[PDB]
Amino acid sequence: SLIPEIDAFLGCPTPDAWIEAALADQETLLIDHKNCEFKAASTALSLIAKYNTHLDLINMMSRLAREELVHHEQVLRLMKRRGVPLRPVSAGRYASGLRRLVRAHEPVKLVDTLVVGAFIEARSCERFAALVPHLDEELGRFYHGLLKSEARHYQGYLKLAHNYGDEADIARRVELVRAAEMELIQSPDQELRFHSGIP
């Protein structure tokens, strides 16, 4: 069943405890979300630069980066309308945690990087969906719009991993990262971030 459904692909749902913390501090959530959109754009560019002879990756990543930059700009606009000031919010543990599972040897270092991307995007999709019933109208609508783009990016990242890797080795990678990702989501965490664990 190539490219499963979001809840099938993921190892756990977003905890209610995370949701409660998120609702109690929507301003730091927004700030971190803004930063996540940007980071996704910059990650895409770093991939283009590392894999500069991989034409398929380059063309998908350049387009993806533009989409993520639109989202970054939209989060900024919404922050502006609602009087949310900018302030520094350092990166959470999640994406680094997953990047540590990545192997050091090409070409498998690439397929793993892309599987990690598929997980980040799948989780963002699931987590937006968990959030939107609890938000005000304009925020819920914005986040609903985003969750649909996250589902496409999840597919995009998995398709690209299959473009450069073998079914079995990917299936192995997905199993290893699934477990690591569940642990980061379910484990306790000393901070609120979009992809933090339970506080």
Sole window of 23-31, 90-98, 162-170, 174-182 interacting with ligand [Kr] (rule: CB under 6 A): 23-31
Angle at which helix 108-131 crosses helix 167-186, to 10 degrees, equals 40
Please tell me the distance from the alpha carbon of residue 193 to that of residue 121, in angstroms, as a whole number: 15
Q: Where are the alpha helices (DSSP H) in 54-107?
A: 55-81, 94-99
Task: Tell me which of a copy of itself, Ca ion, Cl ion, none is bound by residue 56, counting a contact when its beta carbon lies within the kind-specific cut-off of 5 to 8 angstroms.
Answer: none
- Separation in Å, CA 35 to CA 4, 39, 156: 28, 6, 21
| Nearest position to Ca ion, beta carbon | 83
Per CB under 5 A, 71 contacts Fe ion: yes
Contacts with Cl ion, 43-72, as mask; x by CB under 5 A: -----------------------x------
Helix (H, G, I), strand (E, B) or coil at 188: strand
Per CB under 6 A, 43 contacts ligand [Kr]: no
Task: Tell me which of Cl ion, Fe ion, a copy of itself, none is bound by residue 63, counting a contact when its beta carbon lies within the kind-specific cut-off of 5 to 8 angstroms.
Answer: a copy of itself
